[PDB]
Every structure is written in C-alpha cells, then in structure tokens.
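In this section we turn from sequence analysis to structure. A common task in structural bioinformatics is to predict how a protein folds when a small molecule is present, because the ligand can shape the pocket around it. The inputs are simple: the amino acid sequence and a SMILES string for the ligand, here adenosine-5'-triphosphate. Study the lines below before reading on.
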Amino acid sequence: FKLPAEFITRPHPSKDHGKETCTAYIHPNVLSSLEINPGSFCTVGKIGENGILVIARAGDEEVHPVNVITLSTTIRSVGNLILGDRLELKKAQVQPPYATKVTVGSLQGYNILECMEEKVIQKLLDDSGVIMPGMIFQNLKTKAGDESIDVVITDASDDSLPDVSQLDLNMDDMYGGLGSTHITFSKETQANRKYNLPEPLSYAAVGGLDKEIESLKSAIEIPLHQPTLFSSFGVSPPRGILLHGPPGTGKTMLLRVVANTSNAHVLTINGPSIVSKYLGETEAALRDIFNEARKYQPSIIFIDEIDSIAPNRANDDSGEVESRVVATLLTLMDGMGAAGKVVVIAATNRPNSVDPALRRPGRFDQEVEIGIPDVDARFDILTKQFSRMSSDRHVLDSEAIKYIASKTHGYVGADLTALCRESVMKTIQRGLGTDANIDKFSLKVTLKDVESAMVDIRPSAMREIFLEMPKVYWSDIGGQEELKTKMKEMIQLPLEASETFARLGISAPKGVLLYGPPGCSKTLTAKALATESGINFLAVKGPEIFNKYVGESERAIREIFRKARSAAPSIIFFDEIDALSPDRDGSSTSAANHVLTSLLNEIDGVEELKGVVIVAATNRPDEIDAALLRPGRLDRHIYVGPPDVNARLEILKKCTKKFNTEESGVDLHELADRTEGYSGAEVVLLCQEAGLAAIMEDLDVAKVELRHFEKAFKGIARGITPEMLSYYEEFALRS
Amino acid sequence: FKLPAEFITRPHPSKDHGKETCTAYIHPNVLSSLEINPGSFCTVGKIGENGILVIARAGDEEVHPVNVITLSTTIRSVGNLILGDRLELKKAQVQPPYATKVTVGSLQGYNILECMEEKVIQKLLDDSGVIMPGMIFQNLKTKAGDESIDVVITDASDDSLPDVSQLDLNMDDMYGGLGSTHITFSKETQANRKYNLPEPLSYAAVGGLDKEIESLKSAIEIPLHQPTLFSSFGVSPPRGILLHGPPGTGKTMLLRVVANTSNAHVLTINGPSIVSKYLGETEAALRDIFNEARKYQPSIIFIDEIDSIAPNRANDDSGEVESRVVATLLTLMDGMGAAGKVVVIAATNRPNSVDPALRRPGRFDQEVEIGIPDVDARFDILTKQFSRMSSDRHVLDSEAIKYIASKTHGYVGADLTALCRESVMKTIQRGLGTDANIDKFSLKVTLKDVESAMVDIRPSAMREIFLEMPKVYWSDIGGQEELKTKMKEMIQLPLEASETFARLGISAPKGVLLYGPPGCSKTLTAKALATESGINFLAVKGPEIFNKYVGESERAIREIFRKARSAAPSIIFFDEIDALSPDRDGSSTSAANHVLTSLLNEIDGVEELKGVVIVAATNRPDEIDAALLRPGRLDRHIYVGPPDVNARLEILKKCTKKFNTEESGVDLHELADRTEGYSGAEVVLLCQEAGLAAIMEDLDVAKVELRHFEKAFKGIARGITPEMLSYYEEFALRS
Ligand SMILES: Nc1ncnc2c1ncn2[C@@H]1O[C@H](COP(=O)(O)OP(=O)(O)OP(=O)(O)O)[C@@H](O)[C@H]1O
Ligand SMILES: Nc1ncnc2c1ncn2[C@@H]1O[C@H](COP(=O)(O)OP(=O)(O)OP(=O)(O)O)[C@@H](O)[C@H]1O
C-alpha cells in the first residue's frame, strides 16, 4: 500500500567486503508489493537508458528507509550514477547465457605487475555480479608496496540476443580456493569504444580557467570537509555560489565533475518542471525535496536556470509564478543552521535578469565569472581534446593547432566542438564521395578539412558584449623608443609601485589621453601593451555601448566597469571616445550626457581608484568637452601621430616578410623616406595594391619588382594636408 | 482493468517464414478483454481509414510488450502503416464472401517470368489471411539468377455488400502440394485507380533538388546506419536535422518519404495537439514519448511546426506554453546516451520564430535549406508530374514543358500543383459545357488550358528573400570595354587568387562601389553577373527591404546576410542605397543608424570575409555615411557613367530585332549618334514608344518608320544636364 515512486542512491557504510556488488538494501514491503522473489535480480531504471543495470538483490535490516537505497559503489562508479539521482524499479531480466573472456584492463597503469597479481581473478569472480562494463576495486593490501590499482573488464566476446539490453550482465564461474577460458591477462586496454560506455568526466578533462577553477574547488571543498573551523569562526559559511557568463562556456561541466568525483549526495533539478499550475502542491513538493536534501548530513544541491525559476519582480509581473515563491525560498534558504553542511551553487545565463535580492552580500558575496575562453584557454581545450581521442585516429603538429587557435578570437568550447564535429563529418563525406568507402583510419584528419569547417561553420556567437582582441608580439608593431619607454613606464607604475604609493601618497595620475590620425596608433599599440604586460585586457567599441533603448547604455557601461574592477587591477581602454564626448557641438540625445556624467562620477566622483587606469583614444582633439579637459583627469597627453623612421622601417619589414627583400634589391630606406608622410592604414593598403599589381601580371609570383612599387606609390595620393598638423600642434601647446 | 487506448506497430523479427500475414502478437489479457475468439479475425484502427484492416490474430510469448504490435511488412506496405502510428482495437467484421480473381501484376518490371515461376500460386495461397489489395513477398531463392522481384495483386473483380469496408477481404482456395478459377496470372497492368489505394512515396517522386535531397538522405543515413565509426571517433554525433525554407516548397512530402523509405520506427506529431490545459501533462507526455523512442534503438523523431511549439523567449512571454518546454527538451536532448541510433527531424516555415537559443552550433549546427526552384528544377518537376500518369492521360511536347518552365520564375511546387489542378478542372468544365458530357479522353490536355490556368491562378504574394531574376547573358547587355575588363578582373581575382592571397596575406579589399545614373548599368549589370560568372547571385532591392514594421527590416537583413555567408562564397549585390544612406539629413530614425552601424561592424569589424565580396550600387554618392567610406575599405570605384556609342548601338540592335531593319533602311548608327544623351532605360522606353507609334497606324507592322521615330524622339526630353555629369566626374577624380 506504500506504493514507492522514487528512490535515492546511498553510500555503502562499514566498508569491509560484504556483497559490494549486489547490496540492494530495499525494505521487504517493496519487494512483496512488486511480487518478485527477494533472492533474485533487481533493476535500476534511473529514467531511460535501457539495460536497467540488472543486478542481484538482497534485503535490509529494517534500518534503511524506503525512500533511499543503495546499488554498490563500484556499480554506481562504472555506471556514472550520481549519489541521489531519481530512481525507479521494474521487473528483473532473465538469466544471461554465459561469460566468454573477462579480460583485465589495468586502468591508469602501465601493467606489467607480475608477482603483484597474486591471483586477481579469484577476487574478481569470487563476488556475485561483476558486470562487464567495468568494476572498480580498491587494492586493499597486496604484499609489500601498498598503493592502489584499478581494473577494466570491458573487453569481451559475448553476444546477447536482446539488443536493447546493452548492459548484458555476465555470470561468474571459476574453480579455486581462498581454469577460466583462455586465460584472463591479455593486454592493458582501457574501456572499449565498441559499446561506447558513458565516459566519467575527471579533473584533467576540464581546465583552461584554472584561476577560477581552483577558487571554485576550494570554495566547495573547504565547507564540505572542515565545518568545525567555520563554526568556531562564528561568521558562518556562505551557502551560495553564483556562476554566470556567455552561453556555451560549459558551466555545467564543473558541477558534473565535482558531483561525480565526490561521493556525497548529489541531486539536480530541471527548473520549471517541478512547477505546475497548482501552488500548494508545488510548495509541498519543494518542502519534500529540501527535507530529503538536508536529512542526510553531507549533501550538495544543484539548481539550473535560476533566472527562469526566479523572475525579477520589477522587470516583468507576468503572472502565474512570481516573487512570493522567491521570498519563501529566500526565507527557507536563510535558516538551514549556524554551521550547516549543504551548499547550493547557482548557474545562470545572464545576471541582470536574476532578482537582485538573490545575489545579496549575505548569501552570494562570492562571485564566479566564466567569460569567453582566451588564447591560452583555447590552447588548453585543443590539447585536452586531442589527448582525449589520442593520436591513433590522426596526428597533427602543434603548428597547425597554434595557427587554428590564433585564427579563433571569440570562439568558445561549444564552437570548438562544432568545428571538430563538422571537420569529422566533412572528412567522412569526402572520403565516401571520392575514395569509394576506403578505410577511415588512412584518411584521418588534415588541415584543409579544418579550414573548410572554419569557412562553413558560421557560429551564432558573432555578437559578444566582451571582445577579446587577439594578441600580437612587439615584432609586428613598429613604434618609437620614447613612446615604448612611456608606455612601459605607465604600465609598470600601478602594478609595481602601488606598494610604496601608500607611504608616498602620490598614487598614480590615472589619466591617459590618446589623440592622433586615424591611420594607426589606435589599436596596435593597445594590443602590444596588452601582450607585453600579460594582464587581462578587454576591448570595447564606441558605438557598441550605444543602444536604442534609453538607459541600456548606462547599464552596459556600469557592468563593464564592474567587470573591470572584478578582473583584478588591470588597464581599461576605449576604442573611440569621440561619440559620447560631443555634447554641445554635436547635440545628440540626453543619453550621451547621462553616460558622460556617470563616467565622470566613476572616475573622479568623491571616490578614488588605485588598481585600474583609464585610457581614452579620440580621433579629433577639439571634439572633447571642457569637462573632460580638466586638471586632475587625463592630464597626460601623447602625440602618437606621424611616427619617426624606425617605426616605419619596422612596419615595412613586417609587411615585407612574405615578399623577398634581397631579390628586390631595394635598401628599404628610400621607400621609408618617400613614405614618411603616410599613415599605417594607407601604407598597408599601398603594399596591398603593390602585391596585387605584382600578381595579376602573370598569375602566381614569388617576386615583386621595383616598377610595381613605383606605379603603386603614385596610384594613391597622400590624403594629408598640414591643416591637421597645425591643429594638433595648437592643441598640444595649449595643454 | 488497464483499459488500453492506443497501440504501436513493430516489424516482425527473426525473419524466417512463420505467418507473415496474421502475426498480431497480443497478450492474453487483451485477448480476453475483446470477448472474441483468439483464433479469429482482428482489426487495426489506425486512426481512420475505414475497413479497419480486418486481419486474423494470434498470441504472443509473454515477452512481446503489450503496447506494441506486429502486423507484417506486407500489410504495412499495403496500408502505408508508418512505424509508430496510433492503433485502435475493434471487434471483427463479417466473414469474407468469396475470392474471384487474385491476379499478379508484377510492377517495377517487364514481367515475362515463365521459367522461374515455379507455381507462385502455391506460395501465395498457402498463407493464411491474404488481403486482396496486394501481397508483397521477398524473392528469397528461385533457382539460379538471384535478384528480386515485386508482385502486386491490386486487380480483382470481387464486390462486397458493405460499402463501408474498402478492403473487402477474401480467402484462399487451391489444390496442390509442397482450386480457384480462370487461372491467376493475367495481363501486366499497373496499380488500378478504381480503388485508388494510397501509394508509398519514393525518391523519384521529388526532383530538381538532387543536391539537397541527397545531402539530407546522407545526413539521416550515415549517422543512423553506421554509428560505430562515430562512436569510435567519440565526437557526439548530431541527433537533429533542421529543414527551413519558404512555405509551400514541399518539405512535408520529404519528411513523409524519408519516414516511409525505411523500416525503422518513426514518431509523428500533430503540432500543438499534444498541448493540454494541465501544465504537467505536456511535459509528462514529452518525457514518455522520448523514453519510449529511446528504449527502442532504431527510431526517428519528427518535429512539426516548432515555431508554434517553441516561441521566441525574448519576444512573446505570453505564459503557460513558454520556454519551459524548450528547456526540458534541451535537457532530454543533452545526455540520453553516447552512441545512440536515433535522429530528430525538425521543420518550420519561419526560422525567425525559432528561439535564438534553439539555434546553436553546439549540437545543432548543421543546416538544410531549400529555396525556390529554378527553371531547371521546375522543368524537372513538371516532367516528373507528367510522367506520373504518363502519356495515356495527356500528351505534351517537351518544348511546351520547357516554355511553361521558362514562364514560371518565382512560382513554387505547390503553385505548380495548383496550376495542374486548375488546368484539369478547366478542361473538364470546358469539355462538359461544349459537348454535353462527352468522354474526357477526347479533349486531353492542351497548352491553351495550361496558359488559362496560369493566367487565372492569381498568386497571392510572390515575395521572397531569394529573388530570382530572369537569366540574362552577355549579348543582352551592352557596355563599355573598360567596364567589361574591370568586371572580368574583379570576378577572376577571388576564385583563382585565394591561395595567392593566403600565401601573401593581402586577402581582398572586398569592396566594390558603383555610382552613376539610375537608368542602366545598375540592374542590367547585376542581371549579367547572375549568369556570366556561373556563381550564385543575390540581389536585394532598397525599397523591398524597407517596411512599416520596426525591426523586421533588421531581421530580414540579418537573415539574408547569414544565408549568403552560409550558402557559398559568392558575390552579393545590393540594388539601391538611397533609401537608407541619407541619415545625416532629414532627422532619420534610429533604426537606420543601427542598420548602418551593424553593417559597418559586420563588414570589416574584428573579423574578415575572405570568401564573399561586398558590392554596392549607389545613385547619389554625397548621401553616403561619412564613417562608411575610408581608405583601405571599399576603395575600388567605377565611373560607369552614361553608355557610350557602342553600348547604345548594341541596345538599339537588340531592341530592333522585332522589326526589320532592311525595310526601314536605318543604319542603326545615325539614330544612336543623335540619341547620345539618353541612358539605357530611356533608350528602351523611346524604342517602345516608337514601336507603339508604328503599330497604331495599321495594327501589326514589320518595320518602324523614320517619321514615327523622330516624333517619339521630339516628344520626350533628354532629361540630362551637364552639371550632374560634371559632379560625377569631379567625384570620380577624388576617388
Ligand atoms: N571545456 C569544454 N571542453 C569541451 N567541450 C566543451 C567545453 N565547453 C563546452 N563544450 C561543448 O559545448 C557543449 C555545450 O556546453 P554545455 O552544455 O556544457 O554548456 P552550458 O552553458 O551549461 O549549456 P547551455 O548552452 O544549455 O546553457 C558541450 O556539449 C561540448 O560539446
Ligand atoms: N515540388 C513539388 N512537386 C509536386 N507537388 C508539390 C511540390 N511542392 C508542393 N506540391 C504540392 O503542394 C502541396 C503542399 O505541400 P505539403 O502539403 O507537403 O506542404 P509543405 O509545403 O511541405 O508545407 P509548408 O506549407 O509548412 O511549407 C503538396 O501536397 C503537393 O500537392
């Protein structure tokens, strides 16, 4: 009459040996209600995934409640069963025919154990069950050496009639005390891909964000193992961790890894699936799920799509479910206990849509930022996935990996998986079309397939609120020695002299203004400084912050400034400030005025900042208002205009690297002498049509002639009159 | 007590012989629930299709699940029973009266078997059941000569008293070992239209989109037939395929043909019919159907009208049916398994209504897009439609079909079927009203009826995003030789110099500007490019993109840009920019500014487009954005002014082909010299008005008179002024 509906997996206590494979502690009332012999096989429905983990069953001692059961540590580890997943119970399966090979695998080991074997097979098949997808057994004590070792029995040659039963449990039959079928020791293979078991994600599988990953691991590890120190402190641990960022970064992988690696209680929710039309039933279900959550002392609660389940009160009062469930959740979330052990983490797509009451300092004062992967993160992801499918399928040098990673600038791990999948699919289809069903191993993976995948992938993440501009070394950029010394000085002052600035009292001017021709000295200088400094740098455009909605630009500027503070002491930079700055001559809407006032308050409004230094670049000198041109802010000015000879030589030799200089015969000096009146963008375009004039003559060319350079020099006018030079000079002298 | 409602169909396994006609695996409880003899006939409700498929029934072995049923591949083929349709149970009907003919048809072959017949009557009539619409049996082994044949028993002359049953099942009676009347083998007729049984759609039913249907078949067959290679790769092969295009292109028949071309299980939905007033009922049904589809390895999932089921999250937050179903379906789609053998098919008319999060590259990056068929595809579909009922019903020359296809430019396959139906009904009514119920075989189908139906169809809205201009070749366009050289160089550079650009790093300027009079050389050039280059051509009109709705134009621009990018690297042309460029004057709305900044960011902003080429045509270059024309981008400029003497002479020669030049006596050069200030548009206009004046004198004429030409010329002003030419020249000087 009990009619059980859901079951929860539980750890096996007391260790020892016991059954260890077929514990199955279910109350006898459930067994009687299912008209199934207790001394027979059991089932693990776990919602779908046919095979149902046919394992033998036993009985409890009236000490395990019907709501929670156990299904053996090794079985749940092999099946990737998280501790506390939803479970059902159905009719058992018929007996298997026989077992064929049962071959050891020796996972995470180099094998060659010789005397350390001491008849492993006796312990392997001395226990009932032993399912073929694997079995993890601790080493316990094995002569001198201690240590630990794992075994894998995936490889076999047993065929079962029902194709749906992918688990196809195998029986055990050995003769011994304390002849098999053609021995058991045969090579040290890992889990086979013929059955394609679900690979359990490990620590090495995730990475690329070690700075945040280690912090999250510590923040979830120190309360779950050492609560006595926090209780003695009296401040109580924070019970909530908030995760947010661009979609596709894979925030669920971290929680999945820390759930499958840890042996504590793990439960997950589908979001609004529990929520129904009724209110009392949903409230009762919530109380029941939290009751089952905290009834076990070690537990971790995972919530998905908090923004959807907790809509903002002010944003939209749509109806149905609203902020009263949010309030009751907050009330029950403020009072678990003084010490406590249950820790709940939160992952959301966007933070603004989430109710600000949720992320109060008393509950979520720690913030985890998961941004778009950087170049190093892309290196790590490519390397880890290459190591994941090994070099057997294909081999590729590190040069191609670094080139394809340098091509990627705003790509994400989801995008990288899309590229690899499309490359594999294109390789398969090309092989089928051309080679007429040739062996797939020989075809492998080549660079042109990856290039084609890059061409036709068309990712849906072209618009990003945060831009990670690719980094370039100092060789590409050609600058001036005084300019380089100044840039290095103003990037080394706030990061090294901050310790002595306390006793000095000067701190930093924190004001940098950049003005010059639009040809160059606007983005490459920032790229070089970011590359050399090694600090996190973000790029934001002028028109990008502007939006049709009134107040949207204010939220964007406030949130990017908040990210600037949250991303450690670094350097912030604006691509073009000549849009919001004009307010009187350029008229414009009041949104520009509000943004200007907000940024003025943020930089010099009854506050002070020692970590971040604002850098502004403008196209015109006179477009800035008099409010910005005030002593104490942006006092320093850099000419960064018509650079001297050595910068031109550097940029010309960088652009001429592809071409041959010795064969041309030019000394690379007269070109710079005649080009001294040009700018970077027009120099780049000029060398472009010079190459074009070289190429269309007789198609492919590896040599460029002087006549082509002479023709291209007069093709484009200088486009520069000394009016702007005089204006820049008169703007410089008045400062 | 269980009260079953709906059943499912499954193939009979183990092959062999068994029964092959009346398996009907039914559990004993259902047998007792029908209060009828188990050794008697049963029925298949199949939600309609009166007759209810009266077939004999038997029992299962308690292993076969009660929910599903098996009713033999012959009956599935005869009744078009898709693998997974709803099924209903009902009491048996009246006993079969008698059998009359049972004659073999032997379709898809030339018949004339004789030698290897070996008494087919024995095999056909030794099986219990045998329903008269037809028996489909595999060849198995027939002496030496392997291969396979198909037999159809659609022809018969038996009538049953109840007209509700359209199947009128019969019995078998024969004498032999290892009596009917008038033998069995007779004639070679195809499927009879008297009963008009539904026919199974095949690959030959759809044509003209071979490159699309083959790609779809591959994308549904390699991931399903051989998942072992993908499992070995371990790249999580995609499970879903998206079908998109304009309404009426005929995607539903593609889904039906791919569903019935394979014996695997298929799920079919009826749109929002699954939605119920209970919030939990919908999600419960979704998880139930997902689980039942997953626990059978061979399965295909069909999604119809995802736009209605899944609306935009950020656009329509109506309530109840919201993104919660999207979240739960994504959760189900995430981790059902590793290898799998199930694929999902999703089709919708409007990709815009699809939620942006649902359009992601992580595991749904692959796209299958079908557009408006061209003249070749239309001709192929028309000739296939004619061949469907062959020359017996109607006769038409291939030139008539080609002319009809040429006339059809923007039509769709649904419109083509409407044209065919209109022609048929117009012919029927005309023959009836003309000859007082004469036989329909005399009139047949003529080109006049097709033309009348084409005139009377009156298409509602022939507006699309992929405009298909009429094909125009080289001789139809007259222009200067310099422009021809420039266009040849511009089309030759990308395709035959991409490798050189990659080696040199120059890439391409990807900027083409066309400024000139709006008469000619603006759309005629695009029409010429549409055919002479051989590359896919796209034309977007300025007034067309503008609309009353705010933001719809932006969405259309985004959609067309991503479609052009994803389709293939090709030259894209935009017709007229005068409706959006003048934003600095007249107080233009913010939408135009957003469009301009979006195109500026997507053309040359933190990314490059090495495949496609940006081509823009303008009338007034002074109204373009100041921040749009900069050195290094869109640098190429074409004068493309008024046509010269040669171009005007070519236009006159092309337009004069209708009349006779010898009779008129004009040299086709003096008129061009006199008409020097007229661009191509008003040149063809004056030619048309001269022809009008020529034909108003004595109706049809064979030549144009000089007096008529001079009267037409003197009645229309030149419309040109030296000031605009001087302005164009001085603007070209600065470029
Ligand atoms: N670090 C990574 N390594 C490998 N693949 C990754 C990584 N991060 C993301 N992916 C790929 O992106 C896909 C989607 O990522 P995932 O579902 O974990 O992200 P999410 O942001 O939590 O999800 P959602 O898009 O539903 O919000 C994964 O299935 C995987 O293919
Ligand atoms: N290519 C074609 N060849 C022949 N008949 C066609 C073709 N395209 C459409 N038709 C006709 O038009 C009808 C409409 O097509 P159907 O009902 O299959 O919808 P669909 O076009 O796939 O759907 P939707 O309107 O959602 O795009 C077909 O039943 C058929 O009679």
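DSSP finds 25 helices and 16 strands in chain B. As an exercise, try to locate the residues that line the adenosine-5'-triphosphate site and compare them with your own expectations.
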